[PDB]
Design a protein around this nucleic acid. Sequence first.
RNA 1: GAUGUCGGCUCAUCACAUCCUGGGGCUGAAGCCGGUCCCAAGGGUAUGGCUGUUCGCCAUUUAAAGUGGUACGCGAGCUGG
RNA 2: GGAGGUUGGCUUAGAAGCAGCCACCCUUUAAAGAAAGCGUAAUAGCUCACUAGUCGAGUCGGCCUGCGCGGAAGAUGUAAC
Lengths: 38, 173, 140, 120
Amino acid sequence: MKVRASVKKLCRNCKIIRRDGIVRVICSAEPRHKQRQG
Amino acid sequence: SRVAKNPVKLPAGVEIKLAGQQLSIKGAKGALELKVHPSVEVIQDSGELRFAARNGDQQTRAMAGTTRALVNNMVVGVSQGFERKLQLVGVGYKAQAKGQVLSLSLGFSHPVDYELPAGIVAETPSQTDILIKGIDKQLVGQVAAEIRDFRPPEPYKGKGVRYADEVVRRKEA
Amino acid sequence: KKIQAYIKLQVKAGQANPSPPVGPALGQHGVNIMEFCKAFNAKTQGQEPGLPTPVIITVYSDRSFTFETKSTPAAVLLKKAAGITSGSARPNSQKVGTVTRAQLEEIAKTKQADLTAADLDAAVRTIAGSARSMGLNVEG
Amino acid sequence: MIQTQSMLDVADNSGARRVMCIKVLGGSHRRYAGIGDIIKVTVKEAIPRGKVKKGQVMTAVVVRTKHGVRRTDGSIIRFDGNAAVLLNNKQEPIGTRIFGPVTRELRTEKFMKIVSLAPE
RNA sequence: GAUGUCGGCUCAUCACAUCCUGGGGCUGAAGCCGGUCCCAAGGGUAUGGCUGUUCGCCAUUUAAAGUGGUACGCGAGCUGG
RNA sequence: GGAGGUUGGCUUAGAAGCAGCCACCCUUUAAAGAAAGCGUAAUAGCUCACUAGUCGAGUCGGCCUGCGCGGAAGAUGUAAC
Ligand SMILES: [Mg+2]
Ligand SMILES: [Mg+2]
Ligand SMILES: [Mg+2]
Ligand SMILES: [Mg+2]
Ligand SMILES: [Mg+2]
Ligand SMILES: [Mg+2]
Ligand SMILES: [Mg+2]
């Protein structure tokens, strides 16, 4: 994870999910795009 | 389009013990599957099946789509054998199934002796393969995940249990 | 299996064995360099031998590797068109004396104008699109 | 010896004559050190020529004390005088000949050297 | 028409923005080590030399020698440098 | 299928569509950017740009606007209805 206040996409593969009330970012290409809170 | 409009078209030997609230599919190759539907649904009876909500909310619009894929998975399970192909990668690794016991060699100090639940019966054609047969997706997928989480894979060697998704992480310096 | 064109391979025409023009370039492709020499022997004497020859290869797995019949190469013989060997340090803006259309005649005589073009004039227009490569414009 | 700033002599030939405890090694604050424990000494009074200079931080093991060593019985051996044996950076001794008796309670795997070199 | 001011001793209690131990994500993480960030306050959290000192600088340890609030805790409890 | 030249250049096994500065034109073709892009940073691959089938009703984005959601950690006890 990477706790922020402004999550956003980085590549073409990132989809922004709102899982259990928190705006997550999961990336299926690189693990270094995983962002937690924002 | 929406999956809630496409019908089911069940094959030959299928019983529907529908009490309105609680459906029940019986067939060959295993039987006794049943689900309790959330109440805001219309379920017709024919050679096929069609599902319909009543209150046009943001929820029953999603309830009728979820219950269509759940009924469809009960049809295939009494028609087709569910399976999960898990392979073993690494030296000194093996899997030795003894009936209802799946005992493994993972380079630990004590050997794990994983016990299977009722229903699912697993078989090993090799020392580095697992075949997990069952009747429902959620129960087969749950047992296949808990075997995997003993020794998850590695980006440096791959030395760990892995199923057939060949999109495994790799890095090497 | 390995199905996409623009597979880069520049070894000698008639001799696949000199590697450091590309080095280990077709290991992950599947088929090693030393077996392609029977295919480079099938197309010699016109594809600029001696120098290593680039060719669009179609990788199969049944001991057959066809090369597209481009008689005269337009990747290396258009270094010869301006009159140099080593190209400029940046293409089409850095110059050593650019090539014109009057010196694009000797290469364009043997284009095999159906097997890489439609007519012969568009094969002259192929090297009008192939001399824009190496520090050289196509001006006139 | 058994406390910081405890004057005690050495039982060794190449060493000094007297040393002094400055730190009891082991745990968080070990207040005391019995027979068979590692302490850290400063050299307080050397022989006019041995090997060890005066005023040098060394490391020693404790081999004799007036408080005694107690066994799994009501039977204790109790000397009169405190005594240490210097060590190197690794736990082998410096000297050659050990003076006076030792006890057999000390002998472990790393201390099979000095038990063999002493007249008990 | 009086609320006794700094450091030490004794005895403490809460906070978490965690020093140690517990659970994890990413790494320019081979292994041993680490770096960084989320979760966690249950129990722990050094003896000395020099100075009125807190602070500091040293010597030697240790799993670790945490940061703050409580009249910069505490003189109808002590000392008085 | 995913381009015809083609390793597009000095460069570097590799700089080629994926060192650096850059070329970005022209064409076999129903189709193709000498390339978006990870892939062995790099050679593949697989995509993207593209076109054929397959599928048979909606889909995609931006603007204004009502109420909400993260950003949001402290010391005796819930303790800013
Ligand atoms: Mg949860
Ligand atoms: Mg008064
Ligand atoms: Mg916390
Ligand atoms: Mg005070
Ligand atoms: Mg008094
Ligand atoms: Mg008072
Ligand atoms: Mg918090």
